[PDB]
Write a protein that binds this ligand. Structure first.
Ligand SMILES: COc1ccc(SCC(=O)Nc2c3c(nn2C)CCC3)cc1
Length: 116
């Protein structure tokens, strides 16, 4: 509360670490469904069903221009990619299984990096 400060973690490395984690995402072999925005004019239903589209390149752009206030908001956008993926794709599909794989990869890097 006012004048009652909780100890807070050093966050000066956060931007560098999120960038590294995102680079590992981008270079994973199953990252191809998520490297670029879903083409809303070639994929039927996507714009109507998916209210907040998100992809790695957009996350990279936002990270490079100071649009994430904290690492939490960064993880929110990453999770959004895989949540949109689950919403639209069957679990057995190539894209659908990619998102499960890629989600697990991220959450392990997230834990290993910030909960270490
Ligand atoms: C020409 O066929 C293509 C297949 C995959 C891609 S990759 C960009 C992309 O749209 N990925 C994606 C999709 C869905 N979810 N996600 C994440 C539903 C269907 C498409 C581009 C062209």
């Amino acid at each position: 509360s006012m004048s009652v400060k909780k100890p807070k973690r050093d966050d000066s490395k956060d931007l560098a670490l999120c960038s590294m984690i995102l680079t590992e995402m981008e270079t994973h072999e199953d990252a191809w469904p998520f490297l670029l925005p879903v083409n809303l004019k070639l994929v039927p239903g996507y714009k109507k069903v998916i209210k907040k589209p998100m992809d790695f390149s957009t996350i990279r752009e936002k990270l490079s221009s100071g649009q994430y206030p904290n690492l939490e908001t960064f993880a929110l956008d990453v999770r959004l990619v895989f949540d949109n993926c689950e919403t639209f794709n069957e679990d057995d599909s190539d894209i659908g299984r990619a998102g499960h794989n890629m989600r697990k990869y991220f959450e392990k890097k997230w834990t290993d990096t910030f909960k270490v």
